[PDB]
Design an enzyme around this catalytic site. Sequence first.
Site, PDB file in Angstrom:
ATOM      1  N   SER A  43      17.588  -1.998 -18.948  1.00 53.49           N
ATOM      2  CA  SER A  43      16.666  -1.806 -18.102  1.00 53.49           C
ATOM      3  C   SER A  43      17.343  -1.421 -16.796  1.00 53.49           C
ATOM      4  CB  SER A  43      15.813  -2.276 -18.205  1.00 53.49           C
ATOM      5  OG  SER A  43      14.759  -3.069 -19.048  1.00 53.49           O
ATOM      6  N   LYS A  46      17.550   2.396 -15.789  1.00 53.36           N
ATOM      7  CA  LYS A  46      16.307   2.819 -14.718  1.00 53.36           C
ATOM      8  C   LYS A  46      16.504   3.572 -13.960  1.00 53.36           C
ATOM      9  CE  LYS A  46      12.657   0.353 -18.488  1.00 53.36           C
ATOM     10  NZ  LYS A  46      12.552  -0.763 -19.109  1.00 53.36           N
ATOM     11  N   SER A 103       9.894  -2.198 -15.115  1.00 56.93           N
ATOM     12  CA  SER A 103      10.558  -1.855 -16.219  1.00 56.93           C
ATOM     13  C   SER A 103       9.707  -1.870 -17.061  1.00 56.93           C
ATOM     14  CB  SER A 103      11.078  -3.260 -15.993  1.00 56.93           C
ATOM     15  OG  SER A 103      12.372  -3.445 -16.932  1.00 56.93           O
ATOM     16  N   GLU A 139      14.060   4.490 -24.890  1.00 56.50           N
ATOM     17  CA  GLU A 139      13.130   2.743 -25.080  1.00 56.50           C
ATOM     18  C   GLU A 139      12.458   2.985 -26.406  1.00 56.50           C
ATOM     19  OE1 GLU A 139      13.990   0.318 -23.347  1.00 56.50           O
ATOM     20  OE2 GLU A 139      14.363   0.964 -20.937  1.00 56.50           O
ATOM     21  N   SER A 210      17.193  -6.559 -19.498  1.00 50.93           N
ATOM     22  CA  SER A 210      17.316  -7.968 -20.621  1.00 50.93           C
ATOM     23  C   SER A 210      16.993  -7.107 -21.878  1.00 50.93           C
ATOM     24  CB  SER A 210      16.127  -8.751 -21.033  1.00 50.93           C
ATOM     25  OG  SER A 210      15.100  -8.203 -20.042  1.00 50.93           O
TER      26      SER A 210
END
Length: 261
Positions: A43, A46, A103, A139, A210
């Site tokens: 992440s 992002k 997230s 994702e 993570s």
Amino acid sequence: SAVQQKLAALEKSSGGRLGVALIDTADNTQVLYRGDERFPMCSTSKVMAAAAVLKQSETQKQLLNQPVEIKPADLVNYNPIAEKHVNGTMTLAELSAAALQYSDNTAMNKLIAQLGGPGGVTAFARAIGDETFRLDRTEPTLNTAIPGDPRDTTTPRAMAQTLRQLTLGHALGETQRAQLVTWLKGNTTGAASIRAGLPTSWTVGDKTGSGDYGTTNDIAVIWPQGRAPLVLVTYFTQPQQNAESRRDVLASAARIIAEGL
């Protein structure tokens, strides 16, 4: 240096692979540990998607207020904010905030779509001079973190330089940079990571990540009180696919770095 010896000892104690890059903007000095090795971003990617949308908004002045539908089919594995708006809309600003501060993985996928796919996120990195970053997937599969796989990776050195440019430099317009900084400062997922190894009085803006292989990452801009800001990237990954997260390693790395400044 002492710091590189202590980071190597931390790594040995952890069982995994640690990557660190520190830029001290006081003198533009850098501290690197595995600084040119690739690590799965998870992440932390992002930040680049949100910044790419912010860059688009420099020309499309109203873009951040554009409503985007959240449909049930859009939901993926971790959607704390998008779930609250299923069968409704979120603006691009709200999606950017959700991706960064919570997230939210649905929010990231909407940002990727806005940019025309992962190749659009990567293109933005190239446009601001980051030749290392690569986003290949959406994702949640970008978090597979398979050892050796170059997809969805960057290096600590590259990400530190890019994060500096986006937040402290002028890769973005003034209002956009300030928005990104505000978003990072408001992150909600970082308390146990870099922030936990730093003096409580320092202001931190960060993005965690993570993934599988116990991949545990955090990228931060740090504003110590009366002192030039720092950029710190800490990436960590482990050899077992099902390894648990090790945010303490990131806290410890930050603490080791902070001892010395």
